[PDB]
Design a protein around this ligand. Structure first.
Ligand code: XB6
Lengths: 666, 4, 133
């Protein structure tokens, strides 16, 4: 939209009512008269606007009040609360702004943040922005976490995130103006080439795609309308429901052939009975004629009984010649039904072998979206985050998404090559125990008021623990960790000397031999200046291609490439990098997915902070000391960068409110 | 999530 | 509310395809077996009907008669009246056939004739005999 009202939309906020957030901070307003709400909503919206229209400079309260006009700029404290609320919860003055007011050195409270990922860096920025003392512990020798970027010479290529999913309400929208980011549009034209290397004709392409989408819709019907959500005391997965749906369409085809061929036998046997009347009638007319003709043989003069006999035999022959004449009508009237039905046979099969493979590539696309085999996705809940979609078209980062982490890292206490091994949290504060990854003998102790954990979900999932919590995380937190899914998705990046592909095509598919390998290198991306093609490895193929050497993997890529463009047009790559995310021990996977038997309420469980028991028993119930951010912690935007970033902003606000106090809630 |  | 058009999905079916691991390829094998079963039945009847058509070569063209164009009359000559009494005994109340057998009268004056000579030709008696067959 447009106005102060698209400033609310660009902040994921409804511009005509108050959120559950704000009812919490402004319970006076929401329980009060509706006129004041309209005021508040306007101050909320206009302030958001002011920040968004120039997000390279801090939006100070004083400045905010100036642009405000009457009657709205008449309650200076209502404005002051709004502004502080927005600044706390990261809706304004988040990211990389120049600060008018050089922040004071009065540092109150100490926070250790585990992980220098985008969730981590975003909180760090915000906490330091709030005058806390913040230290980041990072196991790797670089920032970004799962925003990895390869750089050798002119060659730049993300091995991690690479798509900004469209800017309508995206916090990266703000970040993209704060950082020189080259956003590139993704052209939807994507042609699939099959195993041999011949482009799939458009007719097929549109035909299959439409079936895919009808097949998805079918599972949805099958989920909501028929409550097929549990089978043999086990939650049903999307992949199961798809098979049941495809079986039932292959079942329909057969049901449909059977009733058609039975329509033919219904009338063949109707004919059969007709021709028996007609064989018998014709043979019964044989003797009639013979009789009559013998009766004309008796020459006149004739007595009357002999005249009657010629005349009667003559009638019964016409009488019997009617019947046979009209039965050849009926025979003719059923002789073309059999020609009609024969030439109107219904569908031979539901999907042909060639067709089914193409369908498998549309399933590889879906397995790549959710970084996991469709047998693992909850049928019920897997599509719960297409409700909060961003408007606009998906984009890619042409300069390496890493430029964003790196930009965030300016100004921040980041200890690299520091692997946390134990987190101790007590009623009186916390100890984080880390080692050096270079030499694991050097041991470090970090003491703090609060720990912000942004450890990847797959790290949190390791048994036996890569990180021990003292005391152990409670049953409700560990069970959410088991229930949730951490999937896997890998990339092969291919560096050449000349664009030998269609440079007006961002991406093109390869259709695979089998089902079992629909994800093995099934999609290629061309997004960078240099000759670089990115190949995805999705689904069950991802977890398997990690046990296979680089050159073999590049080997199969080359083969595929050769088939689609001819063996002489594809030279060897100058530089090759293949990732291996499930192997990476600071990831253990690529991103979370809504596993069968999990739900969106688990993502909320992950974000609940932990409160230790009292030191002195019968002492007052303490504060919470262990906080959680990262993409696996945000229900409405999981498995993305924008979701990671929002989760960092969330916890910084939650920590600042619990350690600096919220003076905006009176 | 589904991309394009 | 409804399955997408061209998708077929009822609660009866799905239960039958989920009843065990192989309940799908079961339900899908009979259908193949009962398809070929009906295909061979079709083949059989086509053969059977083909033979019947042969026995019908020539139809009934040699056994057909020419139609006699004939202006109907209204006078009943003794000969004509005698045809009728016999016609009745063989056609009784098929006034249509009876006129076709005389071939000179109308279907209505045949009906008339019955009452006019009813007494004299003992039609009642005649019809009684015709009932006994
Ligand atoms: C691995 C990977 C991740 C992503 C992608 C690719 C790959 C290979 N991306 C994709 O191709 C497609 C995904 C996608 C795209 C659209 C949609 C969608 C949804 C709805 C509607 C339309 C579209 C859905 C999915 C991709 C993408 N996020 C995105 O928007 N754009 C993308 O296009 N995604 C996700 C993104 O990549 C991550 O979700 C994000 O990066 C989260 O980061 P964090 O939660 O902060 O976590 P971290 O892992 O970054 O940070 C952890 C730090 O902990 C350190 N650490 C560990 N252990 C220790 C220890 N013991 N001691 C000390 N430090 C430790 C570690 O060293 C690291 O420093």
């Amino acid at each position: 939209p447009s106005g102060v009202e698209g400033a609310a939309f660009q902040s994921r906020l409804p511009h005509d009512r108050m959120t559950s957030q704000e009812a919490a901070c402004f319970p006076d307003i929401i329980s009060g008269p509706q006129q004041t709400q309209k005021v508040f909503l306007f101050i909320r919206n206009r302030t958001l606007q002011l920040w968004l229209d120039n997000p390279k400079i801090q939006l100070t309260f004083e400045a905010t009040l100036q642009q405000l006009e009457a009657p709205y700029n008449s309650d200076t404290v209502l404005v002051h609360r709004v502004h502080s609320y927005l600044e706390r919860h990261g809706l304004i003055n988040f990211g990389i702004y120049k600060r008018i007011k050089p922040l004071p050195t009065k540092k109150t409270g100490k926070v250790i943040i585990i992980g220098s990922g985008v969730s981590g860096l975003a909180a760090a920025r915000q906490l330091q922005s709030f005058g806390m003392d913040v230290t980041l512990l990072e196991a790797r020798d670089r920032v970004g976490g799962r925003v990895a970027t390869f750089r050798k010479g002119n060659y730049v290529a993300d091995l991690g995130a690479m798509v900004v999913t469209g800017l309508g309400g995206n916090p990266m929208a703000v970040v993209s103006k704060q950082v020189n980011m080259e956003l590139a549009k993704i052209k939807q034209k994507c042609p699939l080439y099959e195993a041999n290397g011949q482009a799939v004709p458009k007719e097929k392409d549109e035909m299959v795609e439409q079936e895919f989408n009808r097949l998805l819709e079918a599972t949805s019907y099958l989920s909501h309308q028929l409550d097929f959500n549990v089978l043999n005391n086990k939650p049903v997965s999307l992949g199961q429901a798809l098979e049941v749906v495809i079986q039932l369409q292959e079942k329909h085809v057969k049901d449909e052939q059977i009733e058609h061929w039975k329509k033919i036998v219904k009338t063949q046997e109707e004919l059969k009975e007709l021709l028996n009347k007609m064989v018998n009638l014709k043979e019964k007319i044989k003797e009639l004629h013979q009789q009559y003709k013998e009766a004309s043989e008796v020459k006149p003069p004739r007595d009357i009984t002999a005249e009657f006999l010629v005349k009667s035999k003559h009638r019964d022959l016409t009488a019997l010649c009617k019947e046979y004449d009209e039965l050849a009508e009926t025979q003719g009237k059923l002789e073309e039904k059999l020609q009609e039905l024969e030439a109107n046979p219904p569908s031979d099969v539901y999907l042909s072998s060639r067709d089914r493979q193409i369908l498998d590539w549309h399933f590889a696309n879906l397995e790549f979206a959710n970084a996991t085999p469709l047998s693992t996705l909850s049928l019920k809940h897997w599509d719960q985050d297409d409700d909060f979609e961003f408007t606009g078209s998906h984009l890619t980062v042409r300069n390496g998404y890493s430029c964003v982490p790196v930009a965030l890292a300016e100004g921040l206490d980041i200890k690299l090559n520091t692997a946390v091994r134990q987190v101790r949290y007590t009623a009186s504060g916390c100890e984080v125990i880390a080692v050096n990854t270079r030499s694991t003998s050097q041991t470090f102790i970090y003491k703090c008021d609060a720990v912000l954990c942004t450890l990847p979900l797959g790290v949190l999932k390791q048994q036996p623990p890569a990180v021990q919590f003292v005391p152990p995380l409670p049953e409700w937190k560990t069970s959410a960790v088991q229930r949730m899914g951490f999937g896997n998705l890998n990339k092969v990046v291919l560096c050449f000397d000349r664009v030998f592909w269609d440079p007006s095509v961002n991406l093109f598919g390869h259709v695979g031999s089998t089902t079992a390998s629909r994800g093995e290198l099934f999609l290629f991306w061309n997004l960078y200046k240099a000759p670089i093609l990115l190949a995805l490895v999705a689904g069950e193929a991802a977890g398997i291609m990690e046990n296979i050497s680089d050159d073999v993997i590049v080997g199969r890529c080359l083969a595929i490439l050769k088939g689609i463009f001819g063996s002489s047009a594809v030279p060897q790559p100058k530089e090759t990098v293949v990732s291996r995310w499930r192997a990476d021990p600071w990831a253990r996977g690529s991103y979370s997915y809504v596993a069968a038997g999990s739900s969106g309420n688990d993502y909320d469980l992950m974000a609940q902070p932990i409160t230790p028991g009292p030191s002195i028993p019968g002492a007052p119930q303490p504060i919470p000391r262990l906080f959680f951010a990262g993409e696996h912690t945000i229900r409405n935007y999981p498995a993305t960068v924008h979701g990671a970033l929002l989760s960092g902003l969330r916890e910084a606000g939650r920590i600042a409110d619990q350690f600096l106090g919220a003076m905006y809630t009176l | 999530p589904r991309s394009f | 509310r409804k399955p997408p058009k061209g998708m077929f999905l009822s609660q009866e079916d799905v239960e039958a395809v989920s009843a065990n691991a192989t309940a799908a390829t079961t339900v899908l094998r009979q259908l193949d077996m009962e398809l070929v079963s009906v295909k061979r039945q079709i083949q059989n009847i086509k053969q059977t009907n083909s033979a019947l058509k042969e026995k019908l070569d020539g139809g009934i063209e040699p056994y057909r008669l020419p139609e006699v164009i004939q202006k109907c009359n209204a006078r009943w000559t003794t000969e004509e009246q005698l045809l009728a009494v016999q016609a009745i005994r063989k056609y009784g109340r098929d006034f249509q056939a009876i006129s076709d057998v005389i071939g000179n009268k109308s279907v209505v004056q045949v009906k008339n004739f019955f009452v006019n000579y009813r007494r004299r030709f003992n039609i009642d008696e005649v019809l009684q005999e015709w009932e006994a067959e």
